[PDB]
Amino acid sequence: VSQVRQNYHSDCEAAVNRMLNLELYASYTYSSMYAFFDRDDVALHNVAEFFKEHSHEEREHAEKFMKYQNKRGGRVVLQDIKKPERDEWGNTLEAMQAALQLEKTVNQALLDLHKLATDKVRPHLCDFLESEYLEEQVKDIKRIGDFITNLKRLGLPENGMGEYLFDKHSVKES
Amino acid sequence: VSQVRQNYHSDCEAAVNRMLNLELYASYTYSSMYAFFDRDDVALHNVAEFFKEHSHEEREHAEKFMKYQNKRGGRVVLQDIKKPERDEWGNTLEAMQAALQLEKTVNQALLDLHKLATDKVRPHLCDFLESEYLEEQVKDIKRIGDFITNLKRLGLPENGMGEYLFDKHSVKES
Amino acid sequence: VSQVRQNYHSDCEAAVNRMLNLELYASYTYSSMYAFFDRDDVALHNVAEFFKEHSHEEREHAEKFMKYQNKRGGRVVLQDIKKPERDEWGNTLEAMQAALQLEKTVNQALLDLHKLATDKVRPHLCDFLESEYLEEQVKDIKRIGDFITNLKRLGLPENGMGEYLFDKHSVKES
Amino acid sequence: VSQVRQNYHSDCEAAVNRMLNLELYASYTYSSMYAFFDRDDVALHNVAEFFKEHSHEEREHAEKFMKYQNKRGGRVVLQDIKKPERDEWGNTLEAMQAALQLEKTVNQALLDLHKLATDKVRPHLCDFLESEYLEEQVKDIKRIGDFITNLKRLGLPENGMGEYLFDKHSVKES
Ligand SMILES: [Cl-]
Ligand SMILES: [Cl-]
Ligand SMILES: [Cl-]
Ligand SMILES: [Cl-]
Ligand SMILES: [Mg+2]
Ligand SMILES: [Mg+2]
Ligand SMILES: [Mg+2]
Ligand SMILES: [Mg+2]
Ligand SMILES: [Mg+2]
Ligand SMILES: [Mg+2]
Ligand SMILES: [Mg+2]
Ligand SMILES: [Mg+2]
Ligand SMILES: [Mg+2]
Ligand SMILES: [Mg+2]
Ligand SMILES: [Mg+2]
Ligand SMILES: [Mg+2]
Ligand SMILES: [Mg+2]
Ligand SMILES: [Mg+2]
Ligand SMILES: [Mg+2]
Ligand SMILES: [Mg+2]
Ligand SMILES: [Mg+2]
Ligand SMILES: [Mg+2]
Ligand SMILES: [Mg+2]
Ligand SMILES: [Mg+2]
Ligand SMILES: [Mg+2]
Ligand SMILES: [Mg+2]
Ligand SMILES: [Mg+2]
Ligand SMILES: [Mg+2]
Ligand SMILES: [Mg+2]
């Protein structure tokens, strides 16, 4: 075993690997959304950039799990990064609904990891999860829900003017 | 009697206490409106913040009446702060209509106090009311009426796009 | 259920509401202490201001629980804010003893919430409590105990000179 | 009559003259207190300076009534400035008690003037009194009461150490 390893479950090590993959998967989904909104026949650039920035932050979160793995004396084991579920994302509302789901799926996996860490008696891991993942997740989920509520208020999917306005007012101008 | 007390009616003292309570009540109502607009299924954050700021200013007004009471040699007597009338506020229009009412109710109580102070021959109190409460009240009431007129113009309650736009343009961006 | 809601107990939601109320209650108690010490026949202004600042920080803590509630997809439910236990607070020693009790009561409720969150398996809530409430509570309680010890050393309640000196040296000059 | 005179009672004019004299009288009393506390066998210099500053502000208030008189088209009529009641002021407590009385006497005369102005229907005078005299009076009276309470707490008249400490902590260091 690694000379650094202490109080670090095989089970925890494997779960960190799975989480690293899920973050890469989430990043790739968001990249796809970026590319969709950047199409000439979609053309909602602030929306596009929102998703591009989400992609980057999920990739950074993946990197943090690689660093964590090594700090604990586990071994990073990579798997294929699955392509996103969809090739095209419909409109801002559908994309945000998919993002909410994705964030919930990522959160569930993080909470699952936290439960394992709790059962395993792994306090450093629990703290890591709380500090670096769980709060920022809650905020993300809140933000996306807020957005969904606004998109519905604006009359999506039918109301194109409403969609236009969301891109100008709700998301940062890029 | 307090060594500082001069020209200060029991009636005035009691009325200042009642006003202190009413300001706390108004503050708490506005807090509730803040919380409503911050819900994920409401999500009008600039509106939310407008009400949060109104809550803070009403609490400061309460504090000013405590200071006044003591400066005159009366005694602050606190009562329960009643919870707001509603748990949920409908939409921006309904909330602003409730705010107009509340501000009118607070103003009526302030004008009632001013009349008592006038009848009692209490000039320092009259001046305090004029200087610190009555003008800022008139302005508040004007502002909220203006807002109601705009919300009606925007097609509330039905027009969600209009509601969206009010939150972006009429209230300060938070 | 709210579209944002995930891993958030009815029990947790209700407990957050109760805590929001308790913080408002604590704020109101401290306001009363401020007003007492500001009386012309009490006149310990730095003491007064200590309590005024405690009142403000408890109100901010209430606001943080409203924000939390909404971030998780629970619903803020407000109740009356009960008036404080006493209308008058005796002297600096009695007031600080009451403050210690109040802080202990608030801490017990926070620890009770943490236990529920723990039993419920709610890690984000546990972290919130630790980060935003429990440490700052411990410090508050320590500070007030320190003060009580000093007030006893100074000869309170009988030693008015000692009380005078506490207001000049122990609490920040306002 | 003066070419400027409008809505200005003989009664108001005379009352302004009386008030001008009373302010000069109050100034002179405070001067005497300054001189007392500056004696080598009293030697409470911050106390002394407090009273010196009160003397100056009462003289400025006298000057403001001269300016007012002329602005309205009345005529300043001066009378002797009576010497203070006492040649020696005992100690800080006795002096502050005398100051409270004096401030109350000045306030009563100001309130009496305000009543006359009210009965006479003289709104500019009423406003002047409110704005320049009545609030600053209330504050003065509050401050002195606060001080009296502290001096009693400190054990005056007997407790010389308490008197010493008041001069260092309660009044501005000069
Ligand atoms: Cl597809
Ligand atoms: Cl309701
Ligand atoms: Cl009591
Ligand atoms: Cl004498
Ligand atoms: Mg080795
Ligand atoms: Mg496949
Ligand atoms: Mg495949
Ligand atoms: Mg994440
Ligand atoms: Mg984030
Ligand atoms: Mg996220
Ligand atoms: Mg008394
Ligand atoms: Mg009721
Ligand atoms: Mg009720
Ligand atoms: Mg007001
Ligand atoms: Mg205002
Ligand atoms: Mg108002
Ligand atoms: Mg829904
Ligand atoms: Mg009760
Ligand atoms: Mg009760
Ligand atoms: Mg823990
Ligand atoms: Mg707290
Ligand atoms: Mg604290
Ligand atoms: Mg505390
Ligand atoms: Mg002429
Ligand atoms: Mg004589
Ligand atoms: Mg004589
Ligand atoms: Mg004066
Ligand atoms: Mg003054
Ligand atoms: Mg004065």
Cβ atoms A19, A65 nearer than 8 A: yes
Residue corresponding to tokens 């009545």: D134
d(CA A67, CA A69): 5
Nearest Cα residue to B101 out of B90, B87, B85, B116: B85
Choose the mutation target among B2, B57, B76 for the interface with C, i.e. most C CBs under 10 Å: B76
Resolution in A: 1.4
Which parts of B82-122 fold into alpha helices (H)? 92-120
How is residue B73 written in tokens? 């040699």
Which residues are near ligand 5, the ion (C-beta closer than 5 Å)?
A 3
How many other C-beta atoms are found inside a 10 Å radius of the C-beta of residue A158?
Answer: 9
- List all residues 6 or more positions away from D90 whose beta carbon is below 8 Å from its beta carbon: D157
- Does residue C46 come out as left (phi exceeding 0), alpha (psi in the -120 to 50 range) or beta? alpha
Cβ-based contacts of A130 with chain C (< 8 Å): 123-124, 126-127
How many other C-beta atoms are found inside a 10 Å radius of the C-beta of residue A19?
Answer: 22
- B126 with D130: Cβ contact below 8 A: yes
Q: How many domains does chain C have?
A: 1
Q: What was the experiment behind these coordinates?
A: X-ray
Instruction: State yes or no: D49 annotated in a binding site.
Output: no
- A153 with B163: Cβ contact below 8 A: yes
CATH of the domain at A22: 1.20.1260.10
Cβ atoms C100, C141 nearer than 8 A: yes
Cβ atoms D138, B71 nearer than 8 A: yes
Nearest Cα residue to D148 out of B162, B73, A93: B73
DSSP per-residue codes, C135-164: HHHHHHHHHHHHHHHHHHHTTTTT-HHHHH
Q: Does C28 touch chain D (CB under 8 A)?
A: no
d(CA B158, CA D36): 77
Which parts of A5-159 fold into alpha helices (H)? 10-37, 45-72, 92-120, 123-129, 135-153
Nearest Cα residue to B103 out of B166, B29, B17: B29
**C23 three-class SS:** helix
How is residue D34 written in tokens? 């300054």
* Domain around D112: 1-174
Q: Which residues pair with B81 in a beta bridge?
A: C81
- Shortest-distance ligand to the CA of residue B41: 17
How many other C-beta atoms are found inside a 10 Å radius of the C-beta of residue A2?
Answer: 11
Angle at B40 between CA B34 and CA B46, to 5 degrees: 40
d(CA B119, CA B97): 33
Which parts of chain B fold into alpha helices (H)? 10-37, 45-72, 92-120, 123-129, 135-153, 160-169
